[PDB]
Amino acid sequence: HMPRVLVTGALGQIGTDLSLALRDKFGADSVLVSDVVEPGAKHPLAGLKGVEKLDCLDSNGFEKLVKEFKPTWMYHLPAIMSVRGEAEPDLAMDINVNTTRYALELARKYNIRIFIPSTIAAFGDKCGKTMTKDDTIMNPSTVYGVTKVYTELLGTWYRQKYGVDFRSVRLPGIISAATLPGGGATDYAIHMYHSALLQKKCVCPVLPYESLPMMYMPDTLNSLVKIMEAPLEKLTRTVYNITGFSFSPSELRFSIERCTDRTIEVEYVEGPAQKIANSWPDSLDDSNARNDWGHQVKYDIDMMSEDMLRQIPILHGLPSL
């Protein structure tokens, strides 16, 4: 049988692109997408049937929706991420912890296969930052990461105690042409693409040799669907590292220079993202994902850069190459 899929937190970047991919694969009638607010006027989800307002902090309203829709799969995606959560920790705990609590209880009660993402922010400086393993010391330096260590462990206990089919990946940095860049931990990368198209200096807040694991969004979407399709018996764990490729800001600059055939002006002035990024892995070991459920990626850094420099003009109006 084909799934009936509920997505919560659908107005995040991942949630939007995943929502659209699930509608495309399974049909709109089989997917229900929700968020605490309505999509913006020009948002990809605006005006679509099967898009609803749900406050997942209201456990009774969350239950009511799940009871009515009868999902077989849920992607529980609400999140307050690293930079934002350091300044708004109470909201981060509400969103990252309490809505997850409710989601897991609903998955138990209503027999739902439940995806809740984790993050490389779950790691800190004791992780072993070269080819970081799936099992290692977790000492996150952000309250986002703190909350996701707890999600990983609580979901895994729900699997052990009740047989809840809980699945998760530790998302690396996720690059998308749709991203509106600001002060996010990985937003330097998006700024650097924008500066290149604008032909303006980029002041990068992450230091030139600070490597991080990254993925291009099309690859992420493929993996998020694949892990949920996999037979349970093939999964040896609940929580998997997944990666595309690692890069540092200096390596991204060279990729962009190769793709534009221009010199790109970058200066480095450390900002808050650096301290956060330096506590994260340089690269991930994703072998368990590859072997258990066939995680794979199509894009490398130059293929990504050629597509980003095409798509940003289309989506944001910036000058083409």
- The binding site for NAD(+) comprises 13-14, 35, 55-56, 77, 144, 148, 174
Q: Check: CB of residue 118 under 8 Å from CB of residue 289.
A: no
At a CB cut-off of 8 Å and minimum separation 6, what does 41 contact? none
In this structure, are residues 160 and 125 in contact, taking their beta carbons and an 8 Å threshold?
no
Contact 139, 87 (CB under 8 A): no
Q: How far apart are CA 100 and CA 172, in angstroms?
A: 20
| 299 among known catalytic residues | no
Six-digit token string for 217: 């969004």
Identify whether the C-beta of residue 83 lies closer than 8 Å to the C-beta of residue 276.
Answer: yes
CA distance 163 to 33: 25
Q: Please report, in range form, the residues annotated as the binding site for NADH.
A: 13-14, 35, 55-56, 77, 144, 148, 174
The residue type found at 300 is D
Long-range own/partner contacts, residues 152-156 (CB < 8 A, 24 or more apart): 152/118, 152/122, 152/238, 152/239, 154/100, 154/101, 154/104, 155/100, 155/104, 155/114, 155/116, 155/238, 155/239, 156/238, 156/239
The catalytic position among 75, 102, 144, 268 is 144
- Cβ neighbours of residue 238 closer than 8 Å, sequence gap 6 or more: 152, 155, 156, 159, 166, 167, 168
**Would you tell me the crossing angle of helices 187-198 and 301-316 to the nearest 10 degrees?**
70
d(CA 215, CA 242): 9
- Rounded to an integer, what distance in angstroms lies between the CA atom of residue 246 and that of residue 210? 10
How far is residue 157's CA from residue 267's CA, in Å, rounded to a whole number? 46
Query: Which residues carry a binding-site annotation?
Result: 13-14, 35, 55-56, 77, 82, 119, 144, 148, 174, 185-186
Q: Provide the annotated binding site for pyruvate.
A: 82, 119, 144, 185-186
Nearest 5°: phi and psi at 212?
-140, 150
Catalytic residues: 144
